[PDB]
Amino acid sequence: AFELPSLPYAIDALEPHISKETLEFHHGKHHNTYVVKLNGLIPGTKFENKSLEEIVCSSDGGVFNNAAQIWNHTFYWNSLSPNGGGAPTGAVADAINAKWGSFDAFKEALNDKAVNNFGSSWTWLVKLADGSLDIVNTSNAATPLTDDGVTPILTVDLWEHAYYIDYRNVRPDYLKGFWSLVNWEFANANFA
């Protein structure tokens, strides 16, 4: 069966941006529930012996909601880092300049998409088939991982459990936290 990946850092490693408690519920409870829920759904079904990605790329309903959420979340914890934040670097920094003209322009473009992403959703930095960076929003469990020629680069969870303990209703404050945490390294690895 599937297992809950270990967090890539200490539970308080992302303080003061994302709290030890948010990580305890978000990773320890929510992510974990998606994993039990998927395990509880695959016994004696096609998805029996398949990899997570194989499953998301081939299901609908409950199996997809749960599998995608497991993948989307693991992608999310990686998008954050106790040593991330600040100016982008290497190849990603450059492709962001190619696309938006500047990092600041990219930042404002992402924020806009994220604050306005209606309901439980996800906002992604992606690499397109033409090799260019773009920002796309997904709702609930939808993930670009299932889009041909689209390479997820980074993601921001916008379901309210991701920031309500720490920022209540103000997404902009949460996003301020994300930019302090952004894992550019994970970003460049995915990009290249």
Ligand X SMILES: OC[C@H]1O[C@H](O[C@H]2O[C@H](CO)[C@@H](O)[C@H](O)[C@H]2O)[C@H](O)[C@@H](O)[C@@H]1O
Sheet holding 133-139, edge to edge: 133-139, 121-127, 151-157
157 binds, among a second copy, ligand X, Fe ion, none (CB under 5 to 8 A by kind): Fe ion
Structure token digits, residue 137: 């929003």
Q: Which of residues 29-88 bind a second copy (CB under 8 A)?
A: 29-30, 33, 65
81 binds, among ligand X, a second copy, Fe ion, none (CB under 5 to 8 A by kind): none
- The answer to the question of whether 30 is labelled as a binding residue is no
C-alpha distances in Å from residue 147, one per residue of 72, 103, 109, 162, 164: 14, 26, 21, 24, 30
Query: Considering the rule CB under 6 A, would residue 65 count as an interface residue with ligand X?
Result: yes
Binding of a second copy by 169 (CB under 8 A): yes
Report the SS3 class of residue 152. strand
Residues contributing to the site for a second copy (CB under 8 A): 25, 29-30, 33, 65, 118-120, 139-141, 159-161, 164-165, 168-169
